[PDB]
Write a protein that binds this ligand. Structure first.
Ligand SMILES: [Co+2]
Ligand SMILES: [Co+2]
Ligand SMILES: [Co+2]
Ligand SMILES: [Co+2]
Ligand SMILES: [Mg+2]
Ligand SMILES: [Mg+2]
Ligand SMILES: [Mg+2]
Ligand SMILES: [Mg+2]
Lengths: 387, 387, 387, 387
């Protein structure tokens, strides 16, 4: 069977299995969950670690006394379980004060508070052993055109992240930042909507090396984009610092279904890529057990997240191992793709008559790509109607 | 009234007003147009210049004798009209040989031919005075997962553009490249699908300064993204080298409607941004007169493209000039957005008690953003129910 | 100027201007509003009437004593204002018990309770003078395939509505039902997702005459459909019993922006159609003032809803009145469209040689539709760069 | 293994395996295919029959002499193969004359020609044994608002179909019509965009019994809708007369991928429904082998269409047969869903205290739907990590 073990690197945020089910049109259908219990319940399931928003661990506005009380209880569950905290993030979207964003709110004082709120939780994150600190600017954006001048908003966003990089370097912390993009929801349009926009923005920072991305399956799909393709570009750039796994059934509200659900073929191609690419980071699940479920459903859902990954991992390995497939790849010229286009140089290429002058486009066009047989073999493997 | 003059910088590609109306489910509904005639007809309309794909000017496979004959006729119409050729591009998507792409085709020989085909047209482009050379990788992508290894495909894409940069520098040409992104169509998923992905890829090139982007209104909207926001990020990065204007009515096939049509409010915010940002490049129209039209409709459509821009330009200027609006902006704190978040520095910010310790989130949250009044004023101006 | 008066038929639901701003990722940013105050504030704005969910007027679980107390206060504000209550609806989506729907919940007892909850509020609705009772099955649907057998779910949906029709007829009430479709959110997929599905389902009811539809601008657009086209089919069928006006910026979560915002051209074509079609029902606004606003923004937003309609109404009238347009319509053959295709009959048509045998397709194909000039005139009128 | 046999009812249109690969941005990549050869090649593959557009079998404008010559050759291949022709349709979208549609073109003479063109092919269809005649109004719609008055267009559409019903009845033919909906492409918006709109329109015809729908997987998904849900409503109405199977990877241009590709989970739920519902019509494949393929790819793709259906059929049967699943269904109350809500009647329900008065919503709300375990079992079966 497919049993998960901490070696599998499966992590969950406290806000996932702890989602009470409140949605824009309804009230919670599940009671609150104590962080400590989530950690032990997740450990029992085979999880490798957990993640958290500051507000998930410590109630907003809690006093220094209560705060410390909340971390101790949390620390005790981790210690007794050996559960890791590989990632932490800040909540800059729930409280009304962040209604127009945190780092890019028009009000300067909210921006300052947002930075101070973030820095406090970074200290905590490092203390617990977190290697990656995630930022999701869910409230950074607008619903109308003049409410936000994006050029200047980007200036403020850069200022915030540059300030965070200075802090982290001045303290000598060994932690990196990962920007998690999202096209929209809760704002009409969110700034840095996709993996590409985030990657591009990162290269305009004072210390680009400290920042990367934490893409989420469902978010890129909310833009109708190809997640695995997006992930490939992030890997090609050396910026996949983390990743959120879940399911989305197309362009609509952020569903946050359990991994495997939604676009199944995309999930297969994602796993194929992550494993074949050698990604060594956590396989984090940012999902939400549907509000139709009780606590038995919450864990059954959480378990489903890892099982599907393990099953998909097996099918992908089988797929690539298959000699029939390797032959199918050669037939489609996947090997010629890896060959430099002009390893001989520009000049040589310019004097190469068989590259233009003596080239027969019609003859080359007649070559079938043989992509379909290859895809059907991929399908056979996924359905297990073969390895 | 709103009359266009060459000073307005309105340009058109030969393939726009020259589209015969062939679509995936139908045959042409208009006869071929001679480039020379388009140039004169466009000049009469007030256009500033024209653009072209190599295959638009010279028939594919044409001999050196016929080729020269085609350019001469074209050159004669330009000379007599004083029409400029500010941009040129290559056609690497129509011929069957490019069925799997040009720069990223699995077949190495097609990739070489693609580069040679491009370099030839660059020479021509410079000869005609083109300052920007556009690249739209319409065939670079895939319909199935294993048909293309995106990491290596990106390597090939980088190789191609780096080779193009070497060539352009070795010849001392004063011309820049602009990548035109598109999410999908004709391929299931196209590489560098949005402005963000293109911007990010550019910073991985050997000579980033030579490359920028040529975004198209309808393309970003095919991903459901906010075009003006995307344009702002391109401007913030100093990469808006060119721009294609048109209309799209949502997420579906590439419509290429005339500018103004489709998302009208977005067109207003785009114009507002371009003018207020001081963009000084061509206002290029990559549209397609619907195939329901005759030649009278083709020019009426082309004329509509510029009129709408002129009308939108007027409304935007009026909008920003309006003192009632300037007051509305201050009320929404658009001015505080331009104020550095921590001009006093990190240390000072860390010791600022009124930024966290003595901050009252509830009191600040109570402040209305007053975004709606601002938006309704924007609406009033657009409909001319005011300036 | 454009001032609204009760004669304009502008109505608002209590849940609109009364939305506290709680969203899936945040807490309310506005305090509760007393129904009585909304009625007086809306009356002052020029509204014609208001609508309500049972739970909007009476707190869920309220005792018969408190209930009566809540209706009296509400009744007093109406009486003193002369405000009408043309429509009422039930809330079968907020309480956890409706997590799997009301009429189509798998649990039979929840279905019964849902019917009883609805019937109670129908009595109240009639008592206040409501002519239309709206049903929005926001929770009727699923997130996974086997969780719901749609054929049987439809059987249960039909049973519920048939039961409602029997009740309404047995009591002799003069009230009709309007089904409000929505593609998704809060459920992964909602049953009767569009105007078409609702219309089709209605004809399978025992008493079709009693049911029609209450389409919402943003909902059909969440499916990427053409609202005005959808509205036309509902009118053609004689089923547009009501209508919800608002704005949506494309395929994403239900934004519920103020009318005019979102797809502006669609709003123009909608108004053109409603007025030219002679729709005589309320112009109901089911929108949500953005949570970035305070109470000043809430009313400014509400006011914007009516102003935009009045401005659009003017532009449409001007557009159709314009003789230049009437000439443009004839040029596009909008008049031939109204001519029966075969008023002479089938037999005659079969013996008509000029309909096939002697028909010249090429000659007819050469005729331009002249749709662009017509559209640009429509644009000129909308921007007021003309009547 | 999964071998197809004529008993499987797999049919293909000549235009599918015969697509030359011409797309909006490219030229054909495959040569023409002779109908006769397709029939024999498909028969060899295990197909049950074929379908055709009039223009697919007989070249447009062909003389009565050539026409007869084309049908004879076609008839010979069928006879020798024993291949059936269960469905036929008309091509009213390719020729320029249909640029504004057929049945709803503004020009009355084009509408007449469209009807005459259709009637001719109906005669042929019946002669070959076709039981269903499909209509896809690909050109019926618009790109701009005033170019088409949808109310009157619907009148013309109704007139056309009513005329077709009169003809078919006057001749005593035993053939039914199936409307194939599509949201957009090639027109900006197509009339009767979804299954629902088509179903609703059908009930406004003079002889509703003669008409049903021929939904296509990819088309409903172009609107982001749930195909299986749509199919369920068509079945519930007794209108699923035919069905087109294929794949689509989300909201974008009509891909027409091979069945199984695109939304795989949806394909599983579709097959589950068709088989469990007892649909007895052809499993028609309206797909397009990608233009990257040669003829070897064309048949490999065609074969993939049936294999995937056979594999999915097996997995669905296994899924429902599984006792663990049957137990999971009961746990989710799928059985209570089949129980009448008020089998006891309205009056009894009104006097039932345990349906409202004595009902405990909170207690009922606490019941988990147990939908996730059920879905994960569905997943296990699909991946074959179980039956
Ligand atoms: Co999410
Ligand atoms: Co385009
Ligand atoms: Co809504
Ligand atoms: Co199709
Ligand atoms: Mg996430
Ligand atoms: Mg373009
Ligand atoms: Mg509504
Ligand atoms: Mg079809």
């Amino acid at each position: 069977s497919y049993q998960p073990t901490p070696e599998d690197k499966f992590t969950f945020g406290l806000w996932t299995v702890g989602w009470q089910g409140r949605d824009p049109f309804g009230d919670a259908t599940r009671g609150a969950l104590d962080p400590a219990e989530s950690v032990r319940r997740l450990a029992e399931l085979g999880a490798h670690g957990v993640t958290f928003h500051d507000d998930d661990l410590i109630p907003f506005g809690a006093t220094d006394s209560e705060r410390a009380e909340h971390i101790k209880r949390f620390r005790q569950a981790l210690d007794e379980t050996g559960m890791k905290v590989p990632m932490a993030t800040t909540n800059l979207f729930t409280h009304p004060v962040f209604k127009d964003g945190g780092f890019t709110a028009n009000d300067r004082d909210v921006r300052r508070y947002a930075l101070r709120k973030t820095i406090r939780n970074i200290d905590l994150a490092v203390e617990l052993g977190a290697q990656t600190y995630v930022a999701w600017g869910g409230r950074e954006g607008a619903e109308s055109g003049a409410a936000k001048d994006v050029r200047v908003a980007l200036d403020r966003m850069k200022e915030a992240f540059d300030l965070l990089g200075e802090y982290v370097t001045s303290q000598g912390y060994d932690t990196p930042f990962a920007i998690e993009p999202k096209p929209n929801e809760p704002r009409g349009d969110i700034l840095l909507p996709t993996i590409g926009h985030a990657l591009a923005f990162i290269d305009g920072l004072e210390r680009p090396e400290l920042y990367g991305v934490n893409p989420e399956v469902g978010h890129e799909q909310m833009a109708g984009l190809n997640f695995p393709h997006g992930i490939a570009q992030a890997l090609w750039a050396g910026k996949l610092f983390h990743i959120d796994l879940n399911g989305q059934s197309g362009i609509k509200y952020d569903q946050d279904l359990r991994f495997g659900p939604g676009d199944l073929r995309a999930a297969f191609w994602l796993v194929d890529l992550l494993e074949s690419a050698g990604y060594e980071g956590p396989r984090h699940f940012d999902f939400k057990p549907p509000r139709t479920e009780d606590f038995d459903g919450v864990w059954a859902s959480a378990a489903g997240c890892m099982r599907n990954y393990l099953i998909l991992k097996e099918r992908a390995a089988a797929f690539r191992a298959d000699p029939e497939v390797q032959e199918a790849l050669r037939a489609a010229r996947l090997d010629e793709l890896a060959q430099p286009t002009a390893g001989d140089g520009l000049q040589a290429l310019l004097p190469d008559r068989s590259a233009f002058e003596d080239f027969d486009p019609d003859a080359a066009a007649a070559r079938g790509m043989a992509f379909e047989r290859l895809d059907q073999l991929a399908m056979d493997h996924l359905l297990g109607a073969r390895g």
